[PDB]
Amino acid sequence: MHLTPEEKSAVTALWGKVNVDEVGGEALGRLLVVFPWTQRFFESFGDLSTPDAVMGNPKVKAHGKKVLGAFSDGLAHLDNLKGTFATLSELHCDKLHVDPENFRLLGNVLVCVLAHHFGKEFTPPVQAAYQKVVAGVANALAHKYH
């Protein structure tokens, strides 16, 4: 990741303040509501017929937390996202058949949720570093597609 030291530092400082439980459920729920075609991968989660249904779904919440836990690992491995997510990439490709374009959608939704949560603290420079991180993670998750 061509991340600047000041970029790494800003990403890390904000992340130490993130409530993963709240943020994960919100990001995953928002992806499914804003881009409803992504619901195709989550049929087994139950009712996803309305925003409230989605946002309230406990499987959506629990899976959100897990996804964001994985995202946390990446932040501790920013100089090697590829090796960090190699297995998860293989799994999303060979077992789950998820179009990597979805990784990019989730990334931008995540940025929107961090803004919603941190308000003015999510300054344009902080956002810029996070955009690089979400693109980095998406690319690492797509790396073992074949």
Partner: protein, 141 residues
């Protein structure tokens, strides 16, 4: 929007494709799967080996849908209605993939229509395929 000239260009080019449509659709799919592997995530239930009967049969359906769009070039949103519902609510293919297939179709036509694939016609065809993709993607949310 398609201009009168565009419409003439598309009818002429597709008219020269004629009875080879199905085969060109099948080749367009093969080129797509090979050049843009991420598109394969939508066809996990298919045998994607070269010459596959499944690919050949799907290429025909794709080609026939385009032929129909050309046949109803002044009423495309209505002629493609059924297909737009299918891609939006059952299949749920991310919109970026439409550009990939469109590009491969064009490459396929260029490789087979040396004389017809002039710059004006290429331009009309590009707009046509973008129009078709817009329709197929119009009911996504």
């Amino acid at each position: 929007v398609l201009s009168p000239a565009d419409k003439t260009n598309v009818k002429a080019a597709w008219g020269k494709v004629g009875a080879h449509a199905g085969e060109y659709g099948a080749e367009a799919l093969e080129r797509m799967f090979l050049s843009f592997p991420t598109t394969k995530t939508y066809f996990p239930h298919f045998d994607l080996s070269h010459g596959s009967a499944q690919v050949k049969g799907h290429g025909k359906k794709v080609a026939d849908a385009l032929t129909n769009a050309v046949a109803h070039v002044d009423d495309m949103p209505n002629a493609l209605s059924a297909l737009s519902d299918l891609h939006a609510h059952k299949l749920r293919v991310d919109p970026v993939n439409f550009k990939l297939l469109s590009h491969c179709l064009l490459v396929t036509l260029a490789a087979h229509l040396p004389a017809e694939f002039t710059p004006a016609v290429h331009a009309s065809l590009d707009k046509f395929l973008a129009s078709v993709s817009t329709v197929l993607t119009s009911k996504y949310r």
